[PDB]
Design a protein around this ligand. Structure first.
Ligand SMILES: NC(=O)c1ccc[n+]([C@@H]2O[C@H](COP(=O)([O-])OP(=O)(O)OC[C@H]3O[C@@H](n4cnc5c(N)ncnc54)[C@H](O)[C@@H]3O)[C@@H](O)[C@H]2O)c1
Ligand SMILES: NC(=O)c1ccc[n+]([C@@H]2O[C@H](COP(=O)([O-])OP(=O)(O)OC[C@H]3O[C@@H](n4cnc5c(N)ncnc54)[C@H](O)[C@@H]3O)[C@@H](O)[C@H]2O)c1
Ligand SMILES: NC(=O)c1ccc[n+]([C@@H]2O[C@H](COP(=O)([O-])OP(=O)(O)OC[C@H]3O[C@@H](n4cnc5c(N)ncnc54)[C@H](O)[C@@H]3O)[C@@H](O)[C@H]2O)c1
Ligand SMILES: NC(=O)c1ccc[n+]([C@@H]2O[C@H](COP(=O)([O-])OP(=O)(O)OC[C@H]3O[C@@H](n4cnc5c(N)ncnc54)[C@H](O)[C@@H]3O)[C@@H](O)[C@H]2O)c1
Ligand SMILES: O=C1N[C@@](c2ccsc2)(c2cccc(Oc3ccc(F)cc3)n2)CC(O)=C1Sc1ccccc1Cl
Lengths: 328, 331, 327, 327
């Protein structure tokens, strides 16, 4: 008699909260570990083109199962392992080098998405797509176009990380935890991001009202340097360690939490902003969105100054110029 | 007239003294996995990172700091100088040479003994009352080395040991039986490596002895070949190294688990590297994994496992092999 | 337009995915609710009771703590339409023991309550798992299974999960080890006829019975039988002191709910139909270690019992069957 | 030797101790919330009703397997309280039918006259977190009796009022309370002040978008949201007889910042002498930076002439009661 038969009496012979991570590099694995440690999924699937690395990463995670509450960890080059995922996170692709723009990655990662997106949609037609690969705003547009999904189920990580870094720096300046420091960085996840100085507050006390020179060139405290630091942060980290991983992994797990738990929390994520701020094109960029079980259900209509709105329009114009030049 | 002064009214001068400080030495794949795991388990109010590569260290620290909004650890610091390490309750050593494909952990001994000669005195200088958690390989020998250099009592010197081996064994057991590893009980003791001992007698699900049900358990004449489960545990690191170049996630999770018991004074039983002199006929200062009670003072107690003649012989072989290497140690 | 319309632009104009219902909002129901809420097990919590004021007050109190939780929807109502598409339905409704009263003395008045509750739950959540807490839990799990017409896998009684948790707490206190590291099983009836499996008692896989052969024997100088007697009497002791038990059972239920909602496939001592084991030929429900996941009880662990242990379980089983057939 | 000696070979103070004084509905909700948030390595409970206290402690202890707090203690004697980092006061007299305001406040002062010296004796370096009503007056009372610096004396104050306000705001807008920002300050209860200027979603000022916000000339009547905060509090009492879960969660949130030295901003009762023209030793809710030394800083909120007057009236009324009190 088998030991299993002697020990266990079987009564009877489909995952409810499945998450897939595409690309098991530094970003993909940081997302995976953060999601597993937050108990967001009952099943985790991993996909990559490098079969050895993929099997090794899956095994390393599986060896930690005793310390996790995610009972099934799967991987494969074939997308059948991704079937019936509630959320699919795309982190596959070329990463920006020291001093290189994220916009220089566009043709390399567009070609990667041309293969990935149809495979993901085939096995999880009702999933939400969470794009992380750079340039995140353009690649969210690309994923939306290739998938044919409604705009609500296509989300780019966007400025959730930029806003998180801004709040970290704000917190460091004021001696307050980032959770209690409120500030929004919108638009392009990159060089043309927009700091909304008007919305900056601690305990609902407007920083701009207290200090009218906030973010202007008149400012003796040079608060504009906080946003420069945000723009330059990725470049700085890339210069020091070769890539960024932990902060984005944590930012993704935060977005995944609101989606998986249907929290309806407000996050700055890449979404289609056509019809807002005089944008007439199919441009994707970060604006505050209500995140839940159906992805982006609503958009917060931020009151911007004429200067803030102009900066956002410049960001959108730059992104559309790149987007027009794409063939699918 | 600053914005800070206009917004905030200060009641007290900055009275900095961290109550639950953790330090990670070595910010490679292992150190960073340990750091992220500890950060996501809210085990510390302060995290300190040390390395010899200053750029990598600054980059890693910054990457973690950029995630502060999503964490509940208000202070993350780093530096080449151990003054950043001051008053840590727990210091985790992950610095050093790692095995290449097919290389024994025992081949790393001279290289990492050489670096421990520098690290251990620096950690003890700034955190004299800390608990030391050794991860660097060979973990059993390096726990002995850390204990000898520090001059600390044996309770405050802990090696990660077979906590990971036992965890991998339970994962495989669980997969074979269709039960969560949490409900599958089994112990891998001794050397964190090739000479680890599977305690077949203690293997159970719901207190039901697997050896009693299947007397062939762990033997060569076993039709089910359960001895292969332990073989898979021994090879696991080699197979992962072959595939991705190193191991990181499972060890970081295993370290965070040990840190949880220490920081929270849980008094949970873990298979960790400790001095086993006086047990199983071992007369020498050998460090190897045995089940220990882990709390706020590190290892407070040892579980005296009843072993079969075969099991005890295997453990004695492990201890003999480790002492032979320890004997020749120059430091 | 409205401030809401000026501030928020709507994109989308769905069935609950991880819904849990708690029936009965008394001390037990509310302890289960708070435990489940703090463990992030559900995206929707529904509450049902017959006392409408108490139900509204409890719902509101929970809703006022929403900022500190990650369960976005908390609903309540006397009508079971609020319960629709629940993955798990927890029954805590009914009469509780008075000081010195047996759980078996609640059977007839709690059977009548179930005759009304179970058809209403099955109507709105036909594919749910039923988790019975109301006493006598073993008999009422049988009752819920009979009324629902559900397969035995989707009908679970909280059973000896709490008895085993209390046993491990006491074991831990005696040994100076965390209950997590102290292993021991209390099986059978959640009550006076529960069975301590002395053979399975261990720390780090080291058998306590092997080390101390007198374990759970009358001769035993350390009197380890007293740990089990303390387990039997625990509810009686707490009832005498505070009037009822709530926190420990809430935590125990949340633990069972975690295995079910997350499909963990952990082993728990829960009330299930044991027909076919230990010479039991009747439709008796009692605690045995079960594998708990998304389909409830998928498997049963076949514990090796001594002739005395098996006889005690059979006596427990005989007592329960006698009551069951008379309903 | 003993089984313990045969099994375990021995080789060899609480670092994160929390005390809850008063094991009523509030105290027990605080206890369960703190236990489920892993904030302490030791939990101590104190009350005057010895049976209820022992029963509550036991019920919690029986759930030890599901928790990560290795030691739960209780007792009428404050020696169980020794070396607590945080002491939470939820103890209080149950108001009688006739009772005047001063009658009720003096009865609670009489309770504090006994509690506060006993807590300070066993935990001289602890932070005091006052929950007992009237929270503003009793925080002042605790500060006076203890002799502690104002940073180590905190009143739960308006944290619950703000939490309820955000819940209602969230329900109006279809946004999670975490993403709805709004502050209710001043006197906890009927005389609380909604700061309309600070109300926002994603940093978008609601007052800027809708200038009639919180005024009487508002078609949307947002003033009703604050009325509902003051109103829902009475609604819970009428419906279930007390409030527990929301305040328990609110207190655990405050405890988290203190224990983990987070330096998060909370609306808590503190001494506001020197602000808004207040010249007396009055305790009111303002946003404070909470960490390992309690209140280290405060946020200087810009208030309207009306908002400033309300706070001044509140402070004048509180001081009038405070000078006629026997200590
Ligand atoms: N805030 C952000 O949005 C943010 C932050 C950091 C990095 N990134 C981006 O994330 C991406 C990845 O970063 P990284 O550090 O992990 O790089 P990486 O080199 O570590 O990993 C990329 C992985 O993608 C895999 N891959 C390539 N083509 C694939 C395909 N067709 N299918 C499946 N997998 C494929 C590679 O094999 C590799 O494992 C980059 O585009 C980077 O710029 C975004
Ligand atoms: N016990 C276990 O279960 C287990 C599991 C996996 C790996 N390991 C071990 O952990 C160690 C590290 O693994 P890894 O993958 O992180 O290697 P790694 O090369 O990626 O990282 C090693 C780090 O140590 C640093 N370092 C070297 N000398 C130092 C010094 N004198 N002071 C401070 N830092 C110094 C390096 O600069 C480097 O960043 C190895 O010894 C490895 O075998 C143990
Ligand atoms: N380990 C265990 O299994 C365990 C432990 C503790 C208590 N219990 C049991 O749980 C049950 C409840 O305990 P309690 O302390 O919460 O009692 P309680 O009186 O405080 O609560 C019972 C609730 O059930 C409600 N109720 C009654 N009939 C109902 C109906 N037809 N539909 C909906 N709700 C109804 C009541 O109105 C009441 O609110 C008891 O049967 C008790 O013995 C079991
Ligand atoms: N600040 C808030 O937002 C808020 C919210 C809800 C309740 N409350 C207040 O909390 C207090 C308690 O509420 P409750 O529902 O728990 O009341 P309760 O009557 O149920 O509990 C009070 C407890 O205090 C105990 N007690 C009385 N005197 C004592 C003493 N000298 N030492 C130790 N314990 C003593 C009682 O025995 C009792 O157990 C009340 O003052 C209430 O108004 C405050
Ligand atoms: O939730 C709450 N419940 C309490 C209450 C309720 C209505 S007034 C006071 C509460 C608790 C227990 C008994 C109790 O008995 C009463 C009832 C009415 C009284 F006038 C005085 C005491 N009262 C205590 C309390 O402070 C709050 S919070 C709160 C109260 C009023 C307005 C706004 C807020 Cl946020």
């Amino acid at each position: 008699a088998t030991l299993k038969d002697q020990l266990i009496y079987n009564l009877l012979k489909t995952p409810q909260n499945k998450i897939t991570v595409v690309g098991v590099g530094a970003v993909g694995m940081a997302c995976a570990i953060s999601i597993l440690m937050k108990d967001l999924a009952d099943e985790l699937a991993l996909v990559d083109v490098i079969e050895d690395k993929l099997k090794g990463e899956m095994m390393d995670l599986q060896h930690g199962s005793l310390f996790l509450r995610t009972p099934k960890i799967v991987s494969g080059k074939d997308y059948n392992v991704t079937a019936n995922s509630k959320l699919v996170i795309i982190t596959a692709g070329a990463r920006q080098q020291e001093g290189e723009s994220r916009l220089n990655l566009v043709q390399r990662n567009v070609n990667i998405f041309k293969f990935i997106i149809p495979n993901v949609v085939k096995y999880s037609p009702n999933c939400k797509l969470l794009i992380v690969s750079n340039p995140v705003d353009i690649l969210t547009y690309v994923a939306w176009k290739i998938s044919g999904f409604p705009k609500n189920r296509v989300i780019g990580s966007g400025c959730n990380l930029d806003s998180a870094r801004f709040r970290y720096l704000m917190g460091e300046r004021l001696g307050v935890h980032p959770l209690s420091c409120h500030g929004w960085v919108l638009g392009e996840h990159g060089d043309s991001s927009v700091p909304v100085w008007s919305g900056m507050n601690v305990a609902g006390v407007s920083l701009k009202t207290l200090h009218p020179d906030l973010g202007t060139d008149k400012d003796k405290e040079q608060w504009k340097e906080v946003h420069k630091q945000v723009v330059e942060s990725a470049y700085e980290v890339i210069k020091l360690k070769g890539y960024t991983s932990w902060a984005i992994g944590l930012s993704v797990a935060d977005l995944a939490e609101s989606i998986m738990k249907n929290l309806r929390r407000v996050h700055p994520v890449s979404t289609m902003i056509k019809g807002l701020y005089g944008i007439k094109d199919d441009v994707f960029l970060s604006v505050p969105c209500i995140l839940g079980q159906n992805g982006i259900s609503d958009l917060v209509k931020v009151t911007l100054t004429s200067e803030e709105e102009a900066r956002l329009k410049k960001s959108a114009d730059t992104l559309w110029g790149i987007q027009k030049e794409l063939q699918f």
